[PDB]
Design a protein around this ligand. Sequence first.
Ligand code: NI
Length: 498
Amino acid sequence: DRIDVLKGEKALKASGLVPEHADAFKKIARELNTYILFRPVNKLATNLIKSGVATKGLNVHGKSSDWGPVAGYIPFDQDLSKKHGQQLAVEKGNLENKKSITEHEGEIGKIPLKLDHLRIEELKENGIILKGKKEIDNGKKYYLLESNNQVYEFRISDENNEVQYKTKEGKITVLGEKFNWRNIEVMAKNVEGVLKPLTADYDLFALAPSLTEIKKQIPQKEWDKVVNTPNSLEKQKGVTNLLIKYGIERKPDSTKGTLSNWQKQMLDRLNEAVKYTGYTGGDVVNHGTNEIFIINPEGEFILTKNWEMTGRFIEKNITGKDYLYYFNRSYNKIAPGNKAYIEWTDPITKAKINTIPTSAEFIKNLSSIRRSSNVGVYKDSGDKDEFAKKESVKKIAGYLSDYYNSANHIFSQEKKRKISIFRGIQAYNEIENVLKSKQIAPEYKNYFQYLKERITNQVQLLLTHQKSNIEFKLLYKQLNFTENETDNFEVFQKIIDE
Ligand code: NI
């Protein structure tokens, strides 16, 4: 799990959050016994945010800029964002910015970018732009601004800090355009009749509260009456109903993007803590859901370098220590040694995967196959057994997610690993049965063989991680040395041959 992660001040610098904000979060995590995870913030947006600039909310999906004079802000023209020249990307962004203005009837607009005094300085402190030799045009007083832009040229003005821009001599934008000097406009919010510029916001990746702490707050009588009973080990639906009842876990059928009542109070707490530190731009956190910034229940800072590392960190320190977290995205629980993990290629996206899919990924994968081959999982037309067939695929999707999540509501840490392995085995079994009906189309057959192999591989590495001599023992316990050598050798030979 701790695969070369960063921590302390180095983790804080890589995350982009403003130092005083992260520090106030540290207290929340500690007062509430919760893990707080954030996506990394655009590092060129940190100063803007600490200086009070407002953050973008739900209504603006335009990417902020990482380069040029506009760096940190959200350019109306997305060819000035972290998307240097991706045709498809820039076109999607520009559209979103236009719609942001039309759909919010005045609450969102665009205003000319004004690089004040201190900002130009800050840009100069970094490798972004430098001031320079003045320029004259239409009786206007200018100052070009040097930026490694391949395709654009910029410049500022004197009285008004307005910043302008034009295409290079014979260069074309990625949309097939070119033009003369136009002011640079950025996305804005209508505060009290006045449009204020917007910058990057703090993206919550997750909030993982303590399950044991939660249990302690629930009336003892009710808990023992909803938990301690008939469900033998696995299948704790009771735990789930209590978490929903007391506003800890979101409603049954998660609306488009609803937040649990505990999550809403947590947002208020975070935003309130940031205001208390002098922030005057409103809220810094606006919704709750490849490096990840982590603040643990002890106020420590950690930063994971990629998704596999953060998936393993969550399993070991958060989920494995009884904090709450649900995986929607998959990862390999045990990392690759010499023999790389086999891969599957999505027919449509052409993406490659080497993990056991979670439920939603499984549903998507099957969707790619359905598109690409134009047939469903089964072949018998005039559906008969149409009920079990559908149920069958549903059971597999359920077990794939259980492999990653059944241990979320299980208290015993040693039971967590045991239930997870067993879930993987149930998935394998269900998949094999689907293949044993012999009524599966061929493009799906290949994908199911891939699932069988990855499952087999991971379940073998998990068992061994616990008991390194378990392979030997599973076979050894089945042998009998009270018999004579020859008889005992036949038994051995049957077991490994079957
Ligand atoms: Ni956001």
